[PDB]
Write an enzyme that holds these catalytic residues in place. Structure first.
Site, PDB file in Angstrom:
ATOM      1  N   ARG A   1      38.143  33.996  51.640  1.00  0.00           N
ATOM      2  CA  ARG A   1      37.541  32.809  51.031  1.00  0.00           C
ATOM      3  C   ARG A   1      37.689  31.567  51.893  1.00  0.00           C
ATOM      4  O   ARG A   1      36.874  30.642  51.783  1.00  0.00           O
ATOM      5  CB  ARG A   1      38.140  32.540  49.658  1.00  0.00           C
TER       6      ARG A   1
ATOM      7  N   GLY B   1      33.623  36.586  38.914  1.00  0.00           N
ATOM      8  CA  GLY B   1      32.982  36.051  37.725  1.00  0.00           C
ATOM      9  C   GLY B   1      31.698  35.318  38.048  1.00  0.00           C
ATOM     10  O   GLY B   1      30.708  35.414  37.311  1.00  0.00           O
TER      11      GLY B   1
HETATM   12  N1  LIG Z   1      45.130  47.866  33.949  1.00  0.00           N
HETATM   13  C1  LIG Z   1      45.398  46.655  34.416  1.00  0.00           C
HETATM   14  N2  LIG Z   1      46.303  45.821  33.853  1.00  0.00           N
HETATM   15  C2  LIG Z   1      46.546  44.589  34.320  1.00  0.00           C
HETATM   16  N3  LIG Z   1      45.927  44.096  35.411  1.00  0.00           N
HETATM   17  C3  LIG Z   1      44.993  44.835  36.044  1.00  0.00           C
HETATM   18  C4  LIG Z   1      44.661  46.162  35.581  1.00  0.00           C
HETATM   19  N4  LIG Z   1      43.722  46.657  36.389  1.00  0.00           N
HETATM   20  C5  LIG Z   1      43.473  45.720  37.328  1.00  0.00           C
HETATM   21  N5  LIG Z   1      44.237  44.632  37.119  1.00  0.00           N
HETATM   22  C6  LIG Z   1      44.272  43.391  37.886  1.00  0.00           C
HETATM   23  O1  LIG Z   1      43.022  42.718  37.927  1.00  0.00           O
HETATM   24  C7  LIG Z   1      43.222  41.685  38.884  1.00  0.00           C
HETATM   25  C8  LIG Z   1      41.893  41.156  39.378  1.00  0.00           C
HETATM   26  O2  LIG Z   1      41.126  40.769  38.255  1.00  0.00           O
HETATM   27  P1  LIG Z   1      39.991  39.632  38.484  1.00  0.00           P
HETATM   28  O3  LIG Z   1      40.629  38.415  39.028  1.00  0.00           O
HETATM   29  O4  LIG Z   1      39.209  39.617  37.209  1.00  0.00           O
HETATM   30  O5  LIG Z   1      39.147  40.307  39.656  1.00  0.00           O
HETATM   31  P2  LIG Z   1      38.403  39.486  40.838  1.00  0.00           P
HETATM   32  O6  LIG Z   1      39.349  38.543  41.470  1.00  0.00           O
HETATM   33  O7  LIG Z   1      37.833  40.586  41.677  1.00  0.00           O
HETATM   34  O8  LIG Z   1      37.241  38.844  40.117  1.00  0.00           O
HETATM   35  C9  LIG Z   1      44.033  42.330  39.998  1.00  0.00           C
HETATM   36  O9  LIG Z   1      45.017  41.415  40.419  1.00  0.00           O
HETATM   37  C10 LIG Z   1      44.621  43.581  39.355  1.00  0.00           C
HETATM   38  O10 LIG Z   1      46.026  43.663  39.496  1.00  0.00           O
HETATM   39  O1  LIG Z   2      38.883  33.636  41.634  1.00  0.00           O
HETATM   40  C1  LIG Z   2      37.935  33.295  40.890  1.00  0.00           C
HETATM   41  O2  LIG Z   2      37.370  34.114  40.108  1.00  0.00           O
HETATM   42  P1  LIG Z   2      37.452  35.916  40.298  1.00  0.00           P
HETATM   43  O3  LIG Z   2      39.005  36.168  39.885  1.00  0.00           O
HETATM   44  O4  LIG Z   2      36.530  36.191  39.047  1.00  0.00           O
HETATM   45  O5  LIG Z   2      36.923  36.165  41.747  1.00  0.00           O
HETATM   46  C2  LIG Z   2      37.437  31.878  40.985  1.00  0.00           C
HETATM   47  O6  LIG Z   2      38.234  31.114  41.885  1.00  0.00           O
HETATM   48  C3  LIG Z   2      37.514  31.197  39.629  1.00  0.00           C
HETATM   49  O7  LIG Z   2      38.847  31.135  39.127  1.00  0.00           O
HETATM   50  P2  LIG Z   2      39.037  31.081  37.544  1.00  0.00           P
HETATM   51  O8  LIG Z   2      38.513  32.363  36.936  1.00  0.00           O
HETATM   52  O9  LIG Z   2      40.532  30.925  37.422  1.00  0.00           O
HETATM   53  O10 LIG Z   2      38.238  29.869  37.068  1.00  0.00           O
HETATM   54 NA    NA Z   3      35.394  30.334  49.465  1.00  0.00          NA
END
Ligand SMILES: Nc1ncnc2c1ncn2[C@@H]1O[C@H](COP(=O)(O)OP(=O)(O)O)[C@@H](O)[C@H]1O
Ligand SMILES: O=C(OP(=O)(O)O)[C@H](O)COP(=O)(O)O
Ligand code: NA
Ligand SMILES: [Cl-]
Ligand SMILES: [Mg+2]
Length: 416
Positions: A38, A396
């Site tokens: 990022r 998201g």
């Molecule tokens: N079963 C689970 N319980 C708790 N956390 C989980 C589980 N499966 C995945 N995760 C967590 O989800 C996190 C990422 O979620 P999120 O931030 O929504 O994804 P991203 O950053 O790709 O959008 C990871 O840090 C991972 O550890």
């Molecule tokens: O990491 C983000 O989202 P992601 O965990 O859905 O990639 C963005 O920085 C937004 O963070 P937020 O979901 O805490 O507003």
């Molecule tokens: Na970025």
């Protein structure tokens, strides 16, 4: 998209101070950055401003969810400053706040070519508009204070750039509230929006969405609109347990659960049936007796349930087989959210197995799009960044585009 909006390539920055929203919400482990994707993604916009004569570039971002309380112990952007220095080849001044008179003085008239990084925006309740106090009670920001926060941010530049694609779904003060005459989209924002515009215009079919991760309360609320766009959906990671509790009455122990989302699960399944969307949920799990890298682990199925006090932190082998079957059927895939706690090796096998299938799918012509701060870190960890069609900085944010939404951070830009 941006066809109607001001973008940085049309913004005169010579002699101007640029205040730039970026998404530097990078993943951390042992207090170290685990993926600088990022940060590197913002370098083209920053370098463009410097190369065309900007007086300064003031960078602002959040890190994590400190909920409006200062937590420099664990959520400081100071490590990002040191990483950005080596990626730019230039020094970066880090300030320990993002608003107030001392920040305003440091940004008021900097030396030509200065790059300044401000401290975590979410240390202030006025960025999100809501948060918690230091004792953990939920609180709402006062409107007069939100206006002052926005006014202070607006003093830090003469022109505004938003390059924070990963945050562009958030209508937060730094994203929609800066009051400057020129508000332009940066080059990352343009690159990501243009990619998704093309990929979402007439997706290849079957179109599979893979939804995992841990932001259950937020992302379960996006499924309703996604079910009008896709043909299949894997619901995994932390998302699955809310569905399995409602639909199967499964015992989930201390696994992630969303009480509000639970109330719409049956409505979502009815809509998926009405729209012909095949839903694939896990059927087995790796369990843990605590939320720790070194937890005692176990196995569970939907039929057995997860024992009391244990939590499901990865899917099991039969789940991986079912995920692989859906990936094999797809001609286009969007994946946001690991299907287990892949940061911890005990709980990474399901995500690695799924990554392997997505890479194989790419090889036979599937369009594969992986997005998110944490899901993109799976690509870095298993060295698959060049083996999928596109790795997005938005998680998201990418899901909200799949829903058909205009993102607030884009909508708030100046119109051409
Ligand atoms: N079963 C689970 N319980 C708790 N956390 C989980 C589980 N499966 C995945 N995760 C967590 O989800 C996190 C990422 O979620 P999120 O931030 O929504 O994804 P991203 O950053 O790709 O959008 C990871 O840090 C991972 O550890
Ligand atoms: O990491 C983000 O989202 P992601 O965990 O859905 O990639 C963005 O920085 C937004 O963070 P937020 O979901 O805490 O507003
Ligand atoms: Na970025
Ligand atoms: Cl959430
Ligand atoms: Mg994330």
């Amino acid at each position: 998209s941006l066809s109607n909006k001001l973008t940085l390539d049309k913004l005169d920055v010579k002699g101007k101070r640029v205040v730039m929203r970026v998404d530097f919400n990078v993943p951390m482990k042992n207090n170290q950055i685990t993926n600088n994707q990022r940060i590197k993604a913002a370098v083209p916009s920053i370098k463009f401003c410097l190369d065309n004569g900007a007086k300064s570039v003031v960078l602002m971002s959040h890190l994590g969810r400190p909920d409006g309380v200062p937590m420099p112990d664990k959520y400081s952007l100071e490590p990002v400053a040191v990483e950005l220095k080596s990626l730019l080849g230039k020094d970066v001044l880090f300030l320990k706040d993002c608003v107030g008179p001392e920040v305003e003085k440091a940004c008021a008239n900097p030396a030509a070519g200065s790059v300044i990084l401000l401290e975590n925006l979410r240390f202030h309740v006025e960025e999100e508009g809501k948060g918690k106090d230091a004792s953990g009670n939920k609180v709402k920001a006062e409107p007069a204070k939100i206006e002052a926060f926005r006014a202070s941010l607006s003093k830090l530049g003469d022109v505004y750039v938003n390059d924070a694609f990963g945050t562009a779904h958030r209508a937060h003060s730094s994203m929609v509230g800066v009051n400057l005459p020129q508000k332009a989209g940066g080059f990352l924002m343009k690159k990501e929006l243009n990619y998704f515009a093309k990929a979402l215009e007439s997706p290849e079919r079957p179109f599979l969405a893979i939804l995992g991760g841990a932001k259950v309360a937020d992302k379960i609320q996006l499924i309703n609109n996604m079910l009008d766009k896709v043909n299949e959906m894997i619901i995994g990671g932390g998302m699955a347990f809310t569905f399995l509790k409602v639909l199967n009455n499964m015992e989930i122990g201390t696994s992630l659960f969303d009480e509000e989302g639970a109330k719409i699960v049956k409505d979502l399944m009815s809509k998926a049936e009405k729209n012909g969307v095949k839903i694939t949920l896990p059927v087995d799990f790796v369990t843990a007796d605590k939320f720790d890298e070194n937890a005692k682990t176990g196995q569970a199925t939907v039929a057995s349930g997860i024992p009391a006090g244990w939590m499901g932190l990865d899917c099991g082998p039969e789940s991986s087989k079912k995920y692989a079957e859906a990936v094999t059927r797809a001609k286009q895939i969007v994946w946001n959210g690991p299907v287990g706690v892949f940061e911890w090796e005990a709980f990474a096998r399901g995500t690695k197995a799924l990554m392997d299938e997505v890479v194989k799918a790419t090889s036979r012509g599937c369009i594969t799009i992986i997005g998110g701060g944490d899901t993109a870190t799976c690509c870095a960890k298993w060295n698959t960044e060049d083996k999928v069609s596109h790795v997005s900085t938005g998680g998201g944010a990418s899901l909200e585009l799949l829903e058909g939404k205009v993102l607030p951070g884009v909508d708030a830009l100046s119109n051409i």
